[PDB]
C-alpha cells in the first residue's frame, strides 16, 4: 500500500 487502481 498504496498501489495503482486506475
Amino acid at each position: 500500500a498504496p498501489e495503482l487502481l486506475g
Partner: antibody
Amino acid sequence: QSVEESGGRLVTPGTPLTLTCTVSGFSLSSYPMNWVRQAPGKGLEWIGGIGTSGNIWYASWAKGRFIISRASSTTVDLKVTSPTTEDTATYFCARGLYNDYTVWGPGTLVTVSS
Amino acid sequence: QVLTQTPSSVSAAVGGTVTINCQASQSVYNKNYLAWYQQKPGQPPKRLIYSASTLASGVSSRFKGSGSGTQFTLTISDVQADDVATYYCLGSYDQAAHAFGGGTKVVVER
C-alpha cells in the same frame, strides 16, 4: 473486454443493498476495478476500488458507508450498509479508470425510496 | 483529493474554442496523474485524455490537455454542436485514491 453492473433497484432507506460487477474477456485478477456513482443531474464521484493484489481503497466520505470486495472469480461487489435518499444514483463499475485499458460498464440505477 | 473546476460552465459558437480549467488542492502523482472525461446526457463517461496531455485511443486532436502538478486545462478547438456535455477532470495524489472535479458544462452558442 467489458464490464457490467447488476443489482440496481428500488431500495428502502436503511435496508442493505449489494451491487455486482461482472467482467468478461479479461482476468479480474490482472486489472484494478473501480466503483463510481452519479446522483441525478449531479457530478461523478469515485467511491472506491480494488487493486491487483486485493487491497481496497475508498473515498474520504465513503469510508464505512461502502464495502467493496471480490465475491467471485468473475465478480466484484459493492455493499451499501445503510442506504439513504442521498444514495440514489447510477452506479458505474469500470476496469481501471485512468490508463488506456479503461472500460466502463453501462451503469445500474439505484433508487433509495420507501 | 479535492479537484476544483472553474468556472462551472463555458461557452462557444459552433466552431470556436473553449478552455476548461482544473485546479488540484495539492500536486497529483508524478505531476501528471490527471485525466479528462466527457459525459453526454444518458451515456456513460468517455475518457478523452490521460497523463495531463496524452490523447486517449481514438479521441480527436481537437481536445488538448496541458498542465502539471496542480494546475491543469482542457482546451477544445473547433467546437461542434455535438460537444454539448459536462467535462470532468480526474486526479490522484498517490495513484490509488482518485477524485473527480465538479464538472464544467459546455454551452454551444448561437
